[PDB]
Amino acid sequence: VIDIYLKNEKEKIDFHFPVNPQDSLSIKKEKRFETVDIVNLGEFDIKKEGEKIREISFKTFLPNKNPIEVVAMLEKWVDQAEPLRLIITGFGYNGLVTISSFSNTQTAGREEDRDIEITFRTYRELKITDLKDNRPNTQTKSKIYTVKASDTLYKIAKNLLGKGSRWPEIYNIPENKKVIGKNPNIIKKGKLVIPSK
């Protein structure tokens, strides 16, 4: 039992590949090293501390959502800056990736179908004693928030914008200043509030 799930986040879509990746899946691993050759001793291998960006490539076909819409969806995702979550069940792969190249093809027969040839890249985020910041931050929320009964603007700021002290960024928006009263502390249920960015 092998399936491929692409769980996008910036667009809340969970694409499951209708058809398995044809002939074979393959994944390479290559350690980071570079030769150094010393006089009268010869070559030596020195490990480099980082890790490498490795690719997963395969090819499928989309049988008769329609294949046209699926191809459009994947082409749109190709330009996405945010990462996609790729899960391959039988193969055992699971992690954030991003599509480097995507291509579709129509054949003389089977014109409804679209033969697909897609490639992925491992994704890593740049964050630019205490707990390490190893967790990926891929969670998404709507750009407009409906205030609940128990919410306070600091609570909204922490839930929807991070540090919690980011509330003046929400308040200073003129639409938020209009829907919210002139007192930031007092807020009401139901009214819409727009987080920044």
Partner 1 sequence: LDLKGSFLFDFEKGEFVKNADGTLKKCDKVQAYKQWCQKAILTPRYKKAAYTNIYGSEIKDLIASNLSQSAKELEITRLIKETILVHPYTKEVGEFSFNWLENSRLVEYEFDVLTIDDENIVIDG
Partner 2 sequence: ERELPIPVFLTEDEDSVHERMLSNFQDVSTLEGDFIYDATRPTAEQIAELKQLGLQNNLKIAFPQTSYGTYLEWLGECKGVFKNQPTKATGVIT
Partner 3 sequence: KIILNGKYDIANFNEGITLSEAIDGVAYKMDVSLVEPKQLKDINIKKGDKIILIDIAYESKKEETIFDGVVWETRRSEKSKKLTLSCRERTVYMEESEEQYQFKENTATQRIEYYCKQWNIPYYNLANTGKKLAKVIHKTNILDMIKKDLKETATKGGDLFRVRMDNKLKLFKLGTNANVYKLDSILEDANFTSSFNDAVTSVKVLGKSKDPIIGTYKKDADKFGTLQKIKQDEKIKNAKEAKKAAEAMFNSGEETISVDCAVDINRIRAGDKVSLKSKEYYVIDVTHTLDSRPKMKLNIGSLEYIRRKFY
> Starting from the edge strand earliest in sequence, which strands make up the sheet with 114-122, in order?
14-16, 4-7, 84-88, 94-105, 114-122, 55-62
- 167, 154 Cβ separation under 8 angstroms: yes
Q: Considering the rule CB under 8 A, would residue 128 count as an interface residue with partner 3?
A: yes
- What number of chain residues touch a second copy (CB under 8 A)? 55
78 binds, among partner 3, partner 2, a second copy, none (CB under 5 to 8 A by kind): a second copy
4-18 burial: b if 16+ Cβ within 10 Å, else e: bebebbeeeeebebe
| Cβ-based neighbours of 74, under 8 Å, separated by 6 or more | 15, 99, 102, 116, 118
| Cβ-based neighbours of 112, under 8 Å, separated by 6 or more | 63, 64, 67
Q: Considering the rule CB under 8 A, would residue 36 count as an interface residue with partner 3?
A: no
Site string for a second copy, 4-43 (x = CB under 8 A): ------------------xxxxxxxxxxxx-x-xxxxxxx
The distance of closest approach from Cβ of residue 9 to partner 2 in the complex, given in angstroms and rounded to an integer, is 24
Nearest partner of 11 among 71, 62, 83, 101, judged by Cα: 83
The distance of closest approach from Cβ of residue 95 to a second copy in the complex, given in angstroms and rounded to an integer, is 13
Site string for partner 1, 107-146 (x = CB under 8 A): --------------------xxxxxxxxxxxxxxxxxx--
51 binds, among a second copy, partner 1, partner 2, none (CB under 5 to 8 A by kind): a second copy
- DSSP labels for 179-190? HS-SSSS---SS
Footprint on this chain of partner 3 (rule: CB under 8 A) = 126-128
Footprint on this chain of a second copy (rule: CB under 8 A) = 2, 22-33, 35, 37-45, 47-53, 68, 71, 75, 78-79, 81, 90-92, 98-108, 111, 121, 123-124, 126
